[PDB]
Every structure is written in C-alpha cells, then in structure tokens.
C-alpha cells in the first residue's frame, strides 16, 4: 500500500508514563479531563467512564459528586408509572452528546465520532497517535490532494481525509492551574487523559509488576543454585571401566 493509505507514523513522544517504573502525571490527567469536557465532549462520548472513576485520580469525591449532580439521568418510573429524571450520582456514567448514531452522524456531515474510552488502545500509536493527529492538521493540504466534501487533510489519518476538523487552538480552554493552554499543551494533556481512560489500571499494574519482577528474579537465581546443588552428584560422576 501507499504511505498515504497507511497514514504517516507518529513520532515517539516522551510521555511521563513511558518507563517501566513511571506513573501518569495526575496533574496532566486533570487538565486533560478539562480539555475533554470543554472541547471533545461536544462530539465524542466517554461512555465507559463513570463519575466514581475520576475520584482519587483527577478529582476529589466532592468535585466528582458536583459534576454528577449537575446532570439529569433517567430514574425508575414513579407510582403512576410515568417517566422521571433524577440528579446524577457517582455510579452514573458520563453522558454522551448524542442520543444515537443517526443523530451523531447528522451533526457531523455523515461521520460518526467514535467513543473515546478505548481510543488510545484501539489505534496503533496510542497517545502518540492522538497527539500527532490533534496537532497535525497542516494549514494547507499538500498540493494535489483532493479532499472529499466535509473532509479535512490530516496526514496521520489513513487516507489523509478525516471528517474531524482541527479543534485545538491556543487558548480554547483556560486551565484552572494556570498552565498556558497552547495547542501542543492541550493535545498532550488530553492524550494523557484518554490513555488513562483506556487503561486506568496502568499505575497499579506497573507497580505490581515491579514487585513480580523482583520476586521472580530472586526465585530464578535461587532455582539455579538449587538445581546445581541437587544435580552435582550426577554432573560429577566418574567411571572406571575394566572390560570383563
């Protein structure tokens, strides 16, 4: 296939979480949630994430309950069996912008914006692909490219024509921690947050793996000693043959 059909391969960026012993930067996670909430959530759902998931990762219990309580969710019917709404709870999932695929496509010139809960695991590249894509819209498509109607040129996207326009521009978000919200900064934060959303066990997994590596290595060393100890009578065996 042509390189265009594949898409340009994203650079390998030095993410904080790269590194056998490295966690996510949780300050970046928090900022990335705020980009999701104020930019991406217009078109993209995050359906696998519940409010309780943010607690002790990006937000306190109170902040997350406040986010939940601002929304209305379907309650069980009342006593006359009429529909009712309730305020959200920590167990609720983050609600998406559209009621169904048809509504989603209608708002996006036919394209369906995917759910972003698994997108970091569902694309080759992970965080690097998300960062590369969001920051890789050239001002002008390379001379000769004919974009289909409602398409935007982005070399990282396979085929080059993506139905999502550029959305991150300097200062579309005002971070609550005072960080300068440049295109690059917002893309890095949101890519980190989405990577967390795809693999929230990441931090615990790598720490348990450190414990496993240490124990298993020690056991490997000791198993070598013990095998050699038990095998030494066989290895050291000597013979004298006197033909009968």
């Amino acid at each position: 296939m042509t390189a265009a059909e594949h898409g340009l391969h994203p650079a390998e960026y030095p993410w904080p979480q790269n590194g056998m012993l490295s966690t996510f930067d949780h300050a970046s996670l928090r900022r990335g949630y705020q980009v999701y909430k104020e930019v991406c959530a217009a078109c993209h759902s995050l359906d696998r994430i519940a409010w309780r998931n943010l607690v002790g990762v990006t937000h306190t219990t109170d902040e997350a309950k406040a986010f939940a309580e601002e929304l209305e969710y379907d309650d069980e019917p009342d006593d006359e069996g009429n529909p009712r709404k309730r305020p959200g709870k920590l167990a609720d999932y983050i609600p998406g912008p559209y009621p169904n695929e048809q509504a989603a496509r209608a708002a996006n010139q036919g394209a369906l914006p995917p759910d972003l809960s698994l997108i970091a695991k569902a694309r080759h590249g992970g965080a690097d692909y998300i960062f590369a894509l969001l920051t890789g819209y050239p001002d002008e498509p390379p001379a000769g490219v004919v974009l289909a109607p409602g398409m935007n040129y982005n070399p990282y996207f396979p085929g080059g024509g993506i139905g999502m326009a550029r959305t991150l521009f300097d200062g579309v978000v005002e971070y609550e921690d005072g960080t300068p919200a440049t295109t690059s900064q917002m893309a890095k934060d949101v890519a980190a947050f989405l990577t967390w959303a795809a693999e929230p066990e990441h931090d615990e997994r790598k720490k348990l793996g450190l414990k496993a590596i240490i124990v298993i290595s020690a056991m490997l060393g000791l198993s070598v000693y013990i095998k050699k100890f038990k095998w030494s009578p066989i290895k050291n065996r000597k013979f004298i043959y006197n033909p009968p």
Partner: protein, 71 residues
C-alpha cells in the same frame, strides 16, 4: 504561543532542509500542472503527499523530544 510552531520552522530550515526543498519543488510542479488546461482529463495526477511525509517524518524526529521538554 504554541512552542511547536517555532520548533517545526527551525527543523525545516535546518536539519530537514533537503526534504523541505523537495516538497517545495513538488508543490511548484503540481500547482503549475493544475494551472495547465486539460489537467482534469489527465490519467495521472501527481500529488505531494510522499514528499510531505518525508519532510514531516524528518521534522518529527528532530522535534519530538524538544517539544515535550517545554510542556
């Protein structure tokens, strides 16, 4: 302003200058070819995607680490 704007420009003029030239030459040719009549009824229309990828791949190699260092 976006740190990447300046880093990318620096990398294009500097370590990726050969690739920048090739992309530039390509665009000149393709625009000129589009300007000519009976271009729409041609069999093969050249693009500049290949040269663009060579340039971008190069810029990314010379920038990735520098950019993340200043975020």
């Amino acid at each position: 302003p976006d740190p990447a704007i300046a880093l990318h420009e620096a990398a294009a003029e500097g370590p990726c200058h050969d690739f920048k030239h090739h992309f530039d030459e390509c665009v000149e040719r393709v625009t000129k070819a589009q300007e000519a009549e009976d271009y729409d009824h041609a069999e093969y229309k050249e693009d500049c995607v290949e040269e663009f990828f060579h340039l971008q791949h190069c810029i990314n190699d010379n920038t990735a680490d520098k950019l993340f260092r200043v975020l």
